[PDB]
Amino acid sequence: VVANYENASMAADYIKRVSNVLPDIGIICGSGLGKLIEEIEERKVIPYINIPNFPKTTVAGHVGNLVLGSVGGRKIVAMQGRLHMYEGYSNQEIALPIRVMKLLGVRVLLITNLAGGINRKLKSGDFVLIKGHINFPGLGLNNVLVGPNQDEFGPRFPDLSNAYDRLLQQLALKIAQENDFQDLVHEGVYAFNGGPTYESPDESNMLLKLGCDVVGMSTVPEVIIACHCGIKVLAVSLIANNSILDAENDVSINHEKVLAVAEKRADLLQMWFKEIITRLP
Amino acid sequence: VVANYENASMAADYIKRVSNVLPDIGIICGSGLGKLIEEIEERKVIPYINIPNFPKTTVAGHVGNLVLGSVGGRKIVAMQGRLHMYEGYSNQEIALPIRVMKLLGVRVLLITNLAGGINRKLKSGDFVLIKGHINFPGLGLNNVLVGPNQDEFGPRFPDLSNAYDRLLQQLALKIAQENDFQDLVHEGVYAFNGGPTYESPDESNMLLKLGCDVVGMSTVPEVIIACHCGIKVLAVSLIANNSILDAENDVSINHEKVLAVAEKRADLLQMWFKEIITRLP
Amino acid sequence: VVANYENASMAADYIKRVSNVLPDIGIICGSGLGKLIEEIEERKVIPYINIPNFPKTTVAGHVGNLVLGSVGGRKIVAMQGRLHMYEGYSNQEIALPIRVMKLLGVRVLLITNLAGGINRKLKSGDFVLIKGHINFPGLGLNNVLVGPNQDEFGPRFPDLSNAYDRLLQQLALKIAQENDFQDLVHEGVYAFNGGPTYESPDESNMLLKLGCDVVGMSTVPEVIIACHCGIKVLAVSLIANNSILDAENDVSINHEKVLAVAEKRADLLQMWFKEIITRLP
Numbered sequence: 001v002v003a004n005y006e007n008a009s010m011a012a013d014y015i016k017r018v019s020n021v022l023p024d025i026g027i028i029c030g031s032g033l034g035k036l037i038e039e040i041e042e043r044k045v046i047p048y049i050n051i052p053n054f055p056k057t058t059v060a061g062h063v064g065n066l067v068l069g070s071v072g073g074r075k076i077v078a079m080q081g082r083l084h085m086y087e088g089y090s091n092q093e094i095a096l097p098i099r100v101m102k103l104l105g106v107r108v109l110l111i112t113n114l115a116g117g118i119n120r121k122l123k124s125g126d127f128v129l130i131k132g133h134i135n136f137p138g139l140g141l142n143n144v145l146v147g148p149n150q151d152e153f154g155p156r157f158p159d160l161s162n163a164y165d166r167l168l169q170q171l172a173l174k175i176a177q178e179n180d181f182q183d184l185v186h187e188g189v190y191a192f193n194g195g196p197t198y199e200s201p202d203e204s205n206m207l208l209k210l211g212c213d214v215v216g217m218s219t220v221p222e223v224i225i226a227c228h229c230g231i232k233v234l235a236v237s238l239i240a241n242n243s244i245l246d247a248e249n250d251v252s253i254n255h256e257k258v259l260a261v262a263e264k265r266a267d268l269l270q271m272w273f274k275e276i277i278t279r280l281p
Numbered sequence: 282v283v284a285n286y287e288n289a290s291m292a293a294d295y296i297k298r299v300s301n302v303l304p305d306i307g308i309i310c311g312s313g314l315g316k317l318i319e320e321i322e323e324r325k326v327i328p329y330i331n332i333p334n335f336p337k338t339t340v341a342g343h344v345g346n347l348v349l350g351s352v353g354g355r356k357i358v359a360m361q362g363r364l365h366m367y368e369g370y371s372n373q374e375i376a377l378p379i380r381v382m383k384l385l386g387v388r389v390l391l392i393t394n395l396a397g398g399i400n401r402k403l404k405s406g407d408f409v410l411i412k413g414h415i416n417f418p419g420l421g422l423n424n425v426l427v428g429p430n431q432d433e434f435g436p437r438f439p440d441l442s443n444a445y446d447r448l449l450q451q452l453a454l455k456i457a458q459e460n461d462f463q464d465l466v467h468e469g470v471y472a473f474n475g476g477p478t479y480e481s482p483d484e485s486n487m488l489l490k491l492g493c494d495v496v497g498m499s500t501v502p503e504v505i506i507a508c509h510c511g512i513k514v515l516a517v518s519l520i521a522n523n524s525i526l527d528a529e530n531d532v533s534i535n536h537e538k539v540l541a542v543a544e545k546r547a548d549l550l551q552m553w554f555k556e557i558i559t560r561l562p
Numbered sequence: 563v564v565a566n567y568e569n570a571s572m573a574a575d576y577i578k579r580v581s582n583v584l585p586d587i588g589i590i591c592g593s594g595l596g597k598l599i600e601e602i603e604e605r606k607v608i609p610y611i612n613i614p615n616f617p618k619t620t621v622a623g624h625v626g627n628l629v630l631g632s633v634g635g636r637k638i639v640a641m642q643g644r645l646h647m648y649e650g651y652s653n654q655e656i657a658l659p660i661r662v663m664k665l666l667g668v669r670v671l672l673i674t675n676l677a678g679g680i681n682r683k684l685k686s687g688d689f690v691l692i693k694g695h696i697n698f699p700g701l702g703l704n705n706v707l708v709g710p711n712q713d714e715f716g717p718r719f720p721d722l723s724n725a726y727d728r729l730l731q732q733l734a735l736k737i738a739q740e741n742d743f744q745d746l747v748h749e750g751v752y753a754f755n756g757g758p759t760y761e762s763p764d765e766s767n768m769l770l771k772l773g774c775d776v777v778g779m780s781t782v783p784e785v786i787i788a789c790h791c792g793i794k795v796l797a798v799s800l801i802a803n804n805s806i807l808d809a810e811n812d813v814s815i816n817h818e819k820v821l822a823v824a825e826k827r828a829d830l831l832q833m834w835f836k837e838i839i840t841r842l843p
C-alpha cells in the first residue's frame with residue numbers, strides 16, 4: 001500500500017467516523033516512555049488492524065493502537081506501539097500514519113525515544129533537545145522519501161534547515177527551568193544509525209569526530225515525513241549510556257540496562273510533556 | 282528487466298533501425314541545462330516508451346526522449362529527461378541506457394547537474410570540474426553495481442581511480458580561459474547524497490570535515506556504469522548555493538532559487554559544451 | 563526462504579544424516595586462501611544445492627560446498643565458495659549458513675579475506691587481526707539483521723563490543739611469534755565497503771581521517787550473525803595494497819594483482835590457521 005492521498009484519506013475517514021476528536025497535536029512515545037497515553041481524557045482506542053490501509057505489524061507483534069482524547073485541554077492523537085525501520089517496514093509503511101495525522105488536522109508532532117550518548121558530557125538519564133541530524137540512511141539511498149513524490153503532501157526536494165522548531169525547544173527548556181531540572185537538559189545533533197545492532201565502539205569514536213552528540217535508531221524518518229507536509233516537530237532523546245566512555249573502559253550494554261533508565265525518568269518525562277502540550281501555541 | 286547484453290542489444294538494434302546515426306559522444310544534461318539538445322542538427326527524437334527494454338518512467342512523468350544528431354560536426358546521442366535514484370529506479374533501470382550507448386559506439390560521456398557547495402570558496406553560479414567522488418550509497422550496500430556482474434560489459438570489481446579523465450578536465454579549463462570565464466571554474470571532490478532531501482545543516486558541516494567540495498543527488502551512478510564498460514567521463518557541477526555559509530547564517534533554500542541559477546548560466550554552459558564536443562579527441 | 567529456526571533445523575538434520583561429524587569450529591576462507599579445505603581429513607563434501615533451504619548461487623556460479631572433517635584432531639565445518647552481499651544476496655541468504663553452523667554445535671568461527679590497506683604503515687602481503695569495525699551498510703539501514711528478529715537465535719538489539727574475541731587474537735599473535743613471522747602481523751579496525759567497486763582515492767582519504775586501518779567488502783555480515791547467536795570470532799585480513807599510498811602516487815589496481823598477493827601468502831596462512839585450530843580452547 002502506497003502512502004498516497006487516496007489511501008491516507010480512507011484511513012482518516014474511518015477514524016473520524018469512530019472518534020469525534022479533531023486533534024491539533026500528535027505524539028509518538030518510545031518504549032518505556034508511554035505512561036502519558038494511559039492518562040488521556042475522554043479517550044478512544046483504535047487498533048491499527050481495524051484502520052483501512054494501516055501497516056501490518058503482526059510479525060513483530062506487541063501493541064498497536066491509535067489513541068485520541070484530551071490532555072491539558074488540548075485535543076491530541078497518539079501512536080501507541082513501535083514502527084521502526086530496522087524491523088523491515090518500508091518507506092510507505094512508516095509514512096502513512098504521519099500523513100493521516102496531517103489530514104486529521106495535526107500541526108505539531110512531539111517525539112521521544114531512548115538513545116546512546118556520544119558527547120563526553122552526556123550522562124545516563126540526561127535529556128537532549130534535538131536541534132539537527134545526520135541521516136546516514138539518507139546519504140546512502142535509504143531516505144524515507146525515496147520513491148515517487150506524493151505531491152499533495154509536499155515538494156520533491158524538501159529543505160530540513162528548520163525541521164526542529166526553535167520556539168518549541170525554547171518552551172521545553174523554560175518548563176525544565178520552572179521545575180528546577182534544567183541541569184538534566186542539553187541540546188545536540190542526532191545521528192540516525194539504521195540498526196538494530198548498537199553503535200560499535202569504533203563507530204562511536206567516528207561519530208565523535210563527526211560532531212554527533214547522540215545516536216539512535218528512531219525519530220528521523222518521522223521528522224522528515226512531518227517536515228515534508230508542514231508539521232512542526234519537537235524531538236527529545238533520553239540518554240541510556242555514554243558510548244564513548246564505555247568504549248574507553250571496555251564496558252557492555254544490554255536491554256535490561258537500557259529500559260531501567262526509562263523506568264528512572266518515566267514520571268518526570270510524563271509531567272514535562274503534559275505541561276508542554278498544555279502550553280504550546 | 283536486467284541490464285544484460287541481450288536486452289541492451291535489442292534496444293540498440295531498434296535505435297539503429299530508426300536513426301542512421303552512429304554516435305561517438307553521449308550527453309546527459311541536468312534540469313534547466315538542456316538547451317543544447319534543442320539545437321542538435323539533423324536530429325532524430327526517439328521516445329523512451331518506444332525503445333525495447335527502456336525503463337518505465339510514467340509514474341514520475343515529464344519528458345523522456347533519446348535524441349541523435351550532429352553537434353560541431355560530431356555525432357552524438359543525448360538522454361533528454363531525468364533518471365535519478367531518489368525516484369525509486371533500480372540499479373538495472375539506471376544502467377541500461379548507458380550500456381545501450383556503449384553498444385551504439387559511444388566512447389566519451391559528458392554530464393552536467395546542479396549541486397550544493399561545501400568548499401567555503403564556492404559561490405552560487407560557479408562551475409566545478411569533478412575530479413573524484415565519495416559514494417555514500419556505495420559504501421552502504423546501494424552501489425549501482427550491486428547484483429550479478431554482466432561480464433560482457435566489464436569486470437566484477439572495477440577500479441575508479443581514473444573514472445574522471447584528466448585530459449578532458451584540462452580541455453574544459455582551456456576553453457574557459459580562451460573565453461575569459463576561467464574565474465568561474467573550480468575543481469573538486471563530489472559527495473553523492475542519495476536524497477531527495479537537501480543536505481541538512483549538520484550533514485553539510487560533516488561533509489566539510491571529510492574533504493568534500495560539492496554535494497548532489499546525481500551523476501555518480503552513471504559515472505560508475507560508464508567506467509565499468511570503458512567509457513571516458515567529464516562531469517561538471519553548477520553550484521546553486523553554499524550550504525556551509527547557509528548553515529552559519531540560518532538561511533533556507535527552495536526549488537525556485539535553485540532553478541534560477543540554472544537560468545543565469547544556461548547560455549554560457551551551452552556555449553562551453555558545444556566547443557568541448559567540437560574539440561575533444 | 564527466511565533464516566528462521568524451522569528452516570535452519572531442516573538443513574542441519576539433512577547434514578547430520580549424511581556426515582556423522584559434529585563440528586566445534588567453523589571456517590570461511592576467502593578467494594585464493596582456501597588450500598586448507600583440500601587437506602581436511604576423513605572429509606565429506608556436501609554441495610549447497612543438495613542441502614534443504616541453502617541459498618541459490620547458480621547465477622554467480624563457481625564452487626559451492628560444505629566440507630566436514632578433522633584438522634589437527636579437531637572437528638570442523640568449512641564453507642567452500644563465496645557468499646558476499648555485493649552479489650545481491652539478501653540478509654536471509656547470508657545468515658542461514660551461519661545459523662546452521664550454530665545448530666550443528668559450532669562455538670568458534672574463523673574468517674579470512676583479502677582487503678585494502680588504509681593505515682600508512684600497512685604493506686602489501688601484511689596480515690591484520692581485526693579488533694573492531696565501522697559498518698557503513700549498518701549505519702545506512704542495510705544491516706544484515708534488518709527484518710524481524712529470530713528470537714530463538716539471539717536478541718533484537720545485539721551488543722558488538724566483544725564481537726572480536728581478545729584471547730583468540732592473542733593466540734594468533736603468539737603462534738606468529740613462535741614461527742618468527744610476527745613482523746607481518748598487525749591489529750586494526752575494519753571498514754565495511756558494500757562494493758563491488760574498490761574504494762575510490764577520495765573515499766580512502768576519508769577513511770584515514772575516520773580512524774580506519776583496513777577496508778573490504780566481506781566479513782562484517784558473518785561477524786554480526788555469529789555474535790547475535792553467541793559464536794566467538796577470529797577475523798584476519800590479507801592486505802593487497804596500500805590505497806592511501808596509491809592515491810598519492812596515482813596508481814591503479816586490478817584483479818590479477820590482488821590474487822597474486824594471495825598466492826604469495828597462501829601456504830603461510832594455511833600453516834598458521836592449522837596451528838590455531840589445533841590449539842584453540
Ligand SMILES: O=C(O)c1ccccc1C[S@](=O)c1ccccc1
Nearest residue numbers: 031114115116216217218240258719
Ligand atoms: O528504541 C527502543 O525502544 C530501544 C530499546 C532498547 C534498546 C535499543 C532501542 C533502540 S534506540 O532508539 C537506542 C537505545 C539505546 C542505545 C542506542 C539506541
Ligand SMILES: O=C(O)c1ccccc1C[S@](=O)c1ccccc1
Nearest residue numbers: 157312395396397497498499521539
Ligand atoms: O537534480 C536536479 O534537477 C535538482 C533540481 C532542483 C533541486 C534539487 C535537484 C537535485 S541536485 O543534483 C541538487 C541541486 C541543488 C542543491 C543540492 C542538490
Ligand SMILES: O=C(O)c1ccccc1C[S@](=O)c1ccccc1
Nearest residue numbers: 438593676677678778779780802820
Ligand atoms: O573478496 C574477494 O575475493 C576479492 C578478490 C579480488 C578483488 C576484490 C575482492 C573483494 S575484497 O574483500 C578486497 C580485496 C582487495 C582490495 C579491497 C577489497
